[PDB]
């Protein structure tokens, strides 16, 4: 499975002084979500139905 996440930023007071490497930290969260989500459904479902 491959996914694309289009996002934006907000007021730099949060983005700059919330977490180190915000772009990288968000990527780790995305992997956990994708795997966790994928982990719930079966292969056949994920291939056709799970897409949405």
């Amino acid at each position: 499975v491959e996914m694309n996440v289009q996002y934006r930023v907000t007021n730099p007071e949060k983005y700059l002084y919330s977490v180190t490497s915000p772009d990288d930290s968000l990527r780790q969260a995305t992997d956990s979500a994708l795997r966790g989500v994928i982990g719930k459904y079966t292969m056949d479902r994920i291939l056709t139905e799970g897409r949405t």
Binding site: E13, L16, Y17, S18
Partner: protein, 56 residues
């Protein structure tokens, strides 16, 4: 009375720059003595908010 007045004026400026220290928004600085930390309110170490503070 020119060398005496000009000499004192110049030295105070460098002293003040070293003394002033501000704390960033996403950081917090705890002023420290030679080896210890500054305390207050029954030996509760004080952490500084994001504002200006003075250190000898």
């Amino acid at each position: 009375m020119r060398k005496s007045v000009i000499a004192i004026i110049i030295i105070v400026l460098v002293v003040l720059y070293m003394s002033v220290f501000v704390v960033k928004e996403g950081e917090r600085g705890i002023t420290l003595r030679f080896g210890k930390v500054l305390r207050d309110d029954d030996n509760k170490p004080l952490v500084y908010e994001p504002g200006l503070h003075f250190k000898i």
